[PDB]
Amino acid sequence: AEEFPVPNGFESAYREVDGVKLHYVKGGQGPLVMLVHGFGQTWYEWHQLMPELAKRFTVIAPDLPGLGQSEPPKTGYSGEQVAVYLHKLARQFSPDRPFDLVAHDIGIWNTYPMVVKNQADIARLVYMQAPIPDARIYRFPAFTAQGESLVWHFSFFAADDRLAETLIAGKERFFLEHFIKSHASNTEVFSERLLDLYARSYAKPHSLNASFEYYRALNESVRQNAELAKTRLQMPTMTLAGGGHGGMGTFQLEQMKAYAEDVEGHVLPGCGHWLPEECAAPMNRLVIDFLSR
Amino acid sequence: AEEFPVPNGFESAYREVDGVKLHYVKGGQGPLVMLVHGFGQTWYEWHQLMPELAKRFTVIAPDLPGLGQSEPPKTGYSGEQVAVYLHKLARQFSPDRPFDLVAHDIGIWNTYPMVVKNQADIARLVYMQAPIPDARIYRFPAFTAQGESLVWHFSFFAADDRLAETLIAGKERFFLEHFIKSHASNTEVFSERLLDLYARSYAKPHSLNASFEYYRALNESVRQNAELAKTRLQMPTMTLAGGGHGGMGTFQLEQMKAYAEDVEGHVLPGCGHWLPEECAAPMNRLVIDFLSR
Ligand SMILES: *[C@@H](CO)CCCCCC
Numbered sequence A, B: 001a002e003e004f005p006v007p008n009g010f011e012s013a014y015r016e017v018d019g020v021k022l023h024y025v026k027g028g029q030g031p032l033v034m035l036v037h038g039f040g041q042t043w044y045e046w047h048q049l050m051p052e053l054a055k056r057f058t059v060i061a062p063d064l065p066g067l068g069q070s071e072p073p074k075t076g077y078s079g080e081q082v083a084v085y086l087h088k089l090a091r092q093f094s095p096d097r098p099f100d101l102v103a104h105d106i107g108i109w110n111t112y113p114m115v116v117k118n119q120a121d122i123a124r125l126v127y128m129q130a131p132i133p134d135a136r137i138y139r140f141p142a143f144t145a146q147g148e149s150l151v152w153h154f155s156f157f158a159a160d161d162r163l164a165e166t167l168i169a170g171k172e173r174f175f176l177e178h179f180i181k182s183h184a185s186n187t188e189v190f191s192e193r194l195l196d197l198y199a200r201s202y203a204k205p206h207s208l209n210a211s212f213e214y215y216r217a218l219n220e221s222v223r224q225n226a227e228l229a230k231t232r233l234q235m236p237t238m239t240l241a242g243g244g245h246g247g248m249g250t251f252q253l254e255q256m257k258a259y260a261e262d263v264e265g266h267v268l269p270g271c272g273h274w275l276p277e278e279c280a281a282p283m284n285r286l287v288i289d290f291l292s293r
């Protein structure tokens, strides 16, 4: 079965990687581009970008381990462990050529280690709307003069005794609508129909638990990246961030400059966290232009 | 009936203040000391200190509006609004003499405006384990290298859509036990019987909602206090804080130095947030000595 509608001309398929069955959607022809979603969503967040990219590229959009239709990881949920799965998957389809990478939210966490460790395999890189795990995340405020902060969910999802799963189970549709809309500027794009689709996917018990395990490994990922970041990224990079409610603002580019030699950044006004949905036309344009250079 | 056992020589009673029926427990003879509890708790957190204070003082311990057995406020939940109820309650019993005040956690938020605006009515002040609402609270971290932070609950409780009430309902005992123990050093002082009593009290639907309305009014309290704090406190003040896991550490006294001219502070090693329960005997001694000078 398919949790989300596959775009015309794409195929939904599975690939076993180190004992873990990963789900992905694939289409197009040409050089490979891999698009990696973040928390609360699946490959489907890319569904409007994929048909345009597939006119010039082979496009693959996997579900992160444990999320969507992908099995949970067998090693662990830290960035370095999950990146092995995604690197091996990409290299199944591009064993002889570098590929491009686009990543959003915790897709950044789950790709940065494989990018920095296999720089010859990455031709171009686009990161949007999340910090790379490092000590900077310990400086975000718990509470702001406007109200709730952007990243208090880090502590909620990381808390022990399965606090988040115990409270959210049975209320997944309510919680996801609140979480998505509270991080959005253009809230109107999140129709009840679309919210139903995303909520049914992450309400699967192992997907709800997998969602929070990424955050429970966040401190480990910070410790891993403290070693890995001793080597800067050499390939062309682009960051995107929302400028509106829920957006990372100038932080996205300012952090990336410590990681990358060659980086350009954009802040999209009137857009929050969910750039592919809130600001599809300018985001799609920026990504397609950058990868087509 | 009574939500909590009343100590011998004390009475459980009610007074109407500005149309709001407030519950309190009262005992002893002599000058008045009012004890103001915080989140997750009721007057009962003072039940070990009260019989000792009652040997030299009249002791009153109210339930905050909307919590325990007290009615919700009819004005609002900001500190300046709640402080009116507590000030008028204390003046019913000590109209002709200044009274002492001891407050814990959000009891601080709900008493500081009354103290700074009615300094002649306050003889001595003890504050423990929470910031006065001001801009300093915007510097607390959302997440730490050890896991969840101390005050991410500020954003969780202040979120709209009744987020906290909706996620916690049906799981009130579970959530309160996790909250108490995650801010404690000494968890064994919380028997199943005591947790059951506190969980049953704040699980009342209007008390569960009242608990979080104090946080939804927190930024309004910060703005109110920005004007109030132009007047420094002049009465003898003491701060107490835990030095262990869950404790405020040195922050409590360092903040109070900006508000008060005559302040002494203590940090209790081995103690977390719940000083009257985790560290009853030394906390009791320090309060009694300070008030008895
Ligand atoms: C995905 C990472 O947790 C959600 C990030 C929230 C956006 C904050 C700017």
Ligand SMILES: *[C@@H](CO)CCCCCC
Pocket: B038, B039, B105, B106, B129, B130, B150, B151, B183, B246, B247, B248, B273
């Ligand atoms: C009462 C105020 O929200 C609980 C505060 C605990 C913060 C210090 C650990």
